[PDB]
Design an enzyme around this catalytic site. Structure first.
Site, PDB file in Angstrom:
ATOM      1  N   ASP A   1      12.160  12.751 -12.885  1.00 45.05           N
ATOM      2  CA  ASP A   1      11.035  12.998 -11.970  1.00 45.05           C
ATOM      3  C   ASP A   1       9.899  12.130 -12.573  1.00 45.05           C
ATOM      4  O   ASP A   1       9.572  12.285 -13.745  1.00 45.05           O
ATOM      5  CB  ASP A   1      10.683  14.499 -12.110  1.00 45.05           C
ATOM      6  CG  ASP A   1       9.498  14.921 -11.281  1.00 45.05           C
ATOM      7  OD1 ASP A   1       8.751  14.077 -10.818  1.00 45.05           O
ATOM      8  OD2 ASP A   1       9.305  16.169 -11.108  1.00 45.05           O
TER       9      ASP A   1
ATOM     10  N   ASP B   1      -3.531  -1.061  -2.213  1.00 44.78           N
ATOM     11  CA  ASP B   1      -2.838  -2.350  -1.991  1.00 44.78           C
ATOM     12  C   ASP B   1      -3.263  -3.298  -3.135  1.00 44.78           C
ATOM     13  O   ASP B   1      -4.293  -3.994  -3.006  1.00 44.78           O
ATOM     14  CB  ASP B   1      -3.295  -2.976  -0.632  1.00 44.78           C
ATOM     15  CG  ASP B   1      -2.582  -4.228  -0.342  1.00 44.78           C
ATOM     16  OD1 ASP B   1      -1.470  -4.394  -0.886  1.00 44.78           O
ATOM     17  OD2 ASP B   1      -3.111  -5.030   0.391  1.00 44.78           O
TER      18      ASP B   1
ATOM     19  N   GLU C   1       0.126 -12.687  -4.194  1.00 43.21           N
ATOM     20  CA  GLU C   1       0.756 -12.318  -2.946  1.00 43.21           C
ATOM     21  C   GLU C   1      -0.214 -12.411  -1.808  1.00 43.21           C
ATOM     22  O   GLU C   1       0.186 -12.778  -0.707  1.00 43.21           O
ATOM     23  CB  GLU C   1       1.277 -10.849  -3.055  1.00 43.21           C
ATOM     24  CG  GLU C   1       2.065 -10.346  -1.820  1.00 43.21           C
ATOM     25  CD  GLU C   1       1.270  -9.770  -0.715  1.00 43.21           C
ATOM     26  OE1 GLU C   1       0.055  -9.513  -0.850  1.00 43.21           O
ATOM     27  OE2 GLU C   1       1.912  -9.480   0.340  1.00 43.21           O
TER      28      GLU C   1
HETATM   29 CA   LIG Z   1       7.104  13.262  -9.442  1.00 44.38          CA
HETATM   30 ZN   LIG Z   2       0.146  -5.539  -0.639  1.00 47.33          ZN
HETATM   31 ZN   LIG Z   3      -2.795  -6.928   0.904  1.00 50.45          ZN
END
Ligand SMILES: [Ca+2]
Ligand SMILES: [Zn+2]
Ligand SMILES: [Zn+2]
Length: 274
Positions: free
Chosen positions: A3, A97, A131
């Protein structure tokens, strides 16, 4: 598979948040916050016993880096890789993000070491740079792998935005086996999943024939009433109201989604490396 502790994942996000604050507010390619992010992740991996490699490349006149970590051992001819991009856009810290995917992959790598896991397949983890400039770091990696090494890749798992505040649970519909592995984990929690339709680092791999898959919790698209019915949240609002914005901060994370997806990442990595 273990976990993954949510508190450990959140601790990495807190460190990435501080790194962005100390470096101008962002962790973008070519800015100091990106290299400082690479340095934090590399130090945790080196201490856990990984062999780490910094791959340098130049894009838009600035130096970027990918961080590749190999867990010693396993079959060198069957490599399972998992990754997440580590850069943010320049408007903010990029916590959902993609601090979310980066932290989940990092804690999964640390969990492999804490567990003393000896997989059948060799495990390799990567954190991609640039990215947000067009998958530049992952394209660099694939373009530079000799065909003999490309053929040793058994799969590539991608994690990009897995803690969206008004989440959905989306599974990529690429390789059928990787997709089933993730869908079966969510079935055990009784959490429904949908196919990912809403452009990330698995593309370069998919283009050259490597099986790929991954998880996503949604970005700028609006959650429907049927989706709010199955997952909670708010219908009519974006999955991530702070997508690529200055408000993608520590408060832009849904803990349940982050915990579930981090645990699913570990489950897939343990399952597919056996
Ligand atoms: Ca967890
Ligand atoms: Zn991303
Ligand atoms: Zn992004």
């Amino acid at each position: 598979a273990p976990d993954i502790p949510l508190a450990n994942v959140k601790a990495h996000l807190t460190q990435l948040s501080t790194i962005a604050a100390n470096n101008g507010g962002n962790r973008a390619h070519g800015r100091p916050g990106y290299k400082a992010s690479v340095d934090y992740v590399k130090a945790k991996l080196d201490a856990a016993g990984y062999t780490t490699t910094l791959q340098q490349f130049t894009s838009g006149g600035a130096t970027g880096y990918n961080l590749i970590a190999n867990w010693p051992g396993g079959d060198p001819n069957k490599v399972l890789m998992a990754g997440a991009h580590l850069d943010s856009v320049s408007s903010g810290a990029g916590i959902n993000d993609n601090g979310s995917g980066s932290a989940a992959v990092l804690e999964t790598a640390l969990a492999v070491s804490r567990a003393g896991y000896q997989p059948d397949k060799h495990l390799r983890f990567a954190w991609w740079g640039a990215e947000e400039l067009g998958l530049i770091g992952s394209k660099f990696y694939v373009n530079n792998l000799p065909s003999a090494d490309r053929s040793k890749l058994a799969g590539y798992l991608n994690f990009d935005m897995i803690g969206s505040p008004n989440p959905g649970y989306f599974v990529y519909d690429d390789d059928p086996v990787i997709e089933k592995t993730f869908k079966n984990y969510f079935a055990g929690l009784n959490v429904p999943t949908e196919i990912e339709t809403e452009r990330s680092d698995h593309a370069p791999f998919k283009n050259v024939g490597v099986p790929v898959g991954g998880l996503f919790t949604g970005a700028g698209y609006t959650k429907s009433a049927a989706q709010a019915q199955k997952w909670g949240g708010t219908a009519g609002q974006a999955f991530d109201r702070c997508y690529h914005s200055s408000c993608d901060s520590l408060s832009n994370i849904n803990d349940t989604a982050l915990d579930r997806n981090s645990d699913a990442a570990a489950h897939a990595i343990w399952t597919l490396s056996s």
